[PDB]
Ligand binder design. Structure first.
Ligand SMILES: *C(=O)[C@](NC(=O)Cc1cccs1)(OC)[C@@H]1N=C(C(=O)O)C(=C)CS1
Ligand SMILES: [Cl-]
Length: 245
């Protein structure tokens, strides 16, 4: 059961408007239909970078590295570039502000053996954790494409990943990004800088009253000045398709 990714190059106007290039992939859950502006880049695999916080949190929770979304992970004292990293954090706040050292410690505690076994169970990307156990999603060998992200998120939404239902619900809670009377967005941003090409990520889904639209976008990010375009371009596509007002 798969009809195919229906191409819609109309969305490229939003990329060129902001002098950007990239891909947006949408998936209508109720109708089982996928749509993208660039079928090739939709299957192009990249480093997941901070979007790896979704599987990392799941494993850490299911193994007991993280007890719940309230456990405090104390700042190790090292002053870092991002100001919000230099405080204590919980799972909600570590995901919101994308606190790498918190998740690097998660990976070290998970272990290379369990990280590989768990990502194979998740069917996540190329399932290659080669590199440092606490940095392989930043400069190692793991690659995931936008369509593979949607595939992974769909299983997470339906509690179908091979971790406990509780772990999956906690992560989906920590993914909450926006909510109003019209929609709910559960998503994770991402930014890959070490290995070329430099790209920005945004993967997640839009919850409506009677449907859910999964999305996974990436775009060339030569400078950090356009990080806001990850969400801005994604929403412009969502508004054009009448998914959000
Ligand atoms: C996750 O993507 C994030 N990105 C970076 O720190 C960029 C890199 C540094 C070394 C290799 S990639 O941490 C891994 C966080 N990402 C975001 C985001 O937009 O999601 C941030 C703005 C904070 S750093
Ligand atoms: Cl929630």
């Amino acid at each position: 059961y798969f009809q195919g990714w229906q191409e819609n190059k109309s969305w490229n106007a939003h990329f060129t408007e902001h002098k950007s290039q990239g891909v947006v992939v949408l998936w209508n859950e109720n109708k089982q239909q996928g749509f993208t502006n660039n079928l090739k880049r939709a299957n192009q695999a990249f480093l997941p970078a901070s979007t790896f916080k979704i599987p990392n949190s799941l494993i850490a929770l299911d193994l007991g590295v993280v007890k719940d979304e309230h456990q405090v992970f104390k700042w190790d004292g090292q002053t870092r570039d991002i100001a919000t990293w230099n405080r204590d954090h919980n799972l909600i706040t570590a995901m919101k502000y994308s606190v790498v050292p918190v998740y690097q410690e998660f990976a070290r505690q998970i272990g290379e053996a369990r990280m590989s076994k768990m990502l194979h169970a998740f069917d996540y990307g190329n399932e290659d954790i080669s590199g440092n156990v606490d940095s392989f999603w930043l400069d190692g060998g793991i690659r995931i494409s936008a369509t593979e992200q949607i595939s992974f998120l769909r299983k997470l939404y339906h509690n179908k990943l091979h971790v406990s239902e509780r772990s999956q619900r906690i992560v989906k809670q920590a993914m909450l990004t926006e909510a109003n009377g019209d929609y709910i967005i559960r998503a994770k941003t991402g930014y890959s800088t070490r290995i070329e090409p430099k790209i920005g990520w945004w993967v997640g889904w839009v919850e409506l009253d009677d449907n859910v639209w999964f999305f996974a976008m990436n775009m060339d990010m030569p400078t950090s000045d356009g990080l806001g375009l990850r969400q801005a371009i994604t929403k412009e596509v969502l508004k054009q398709e009448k998914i959000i007002p």
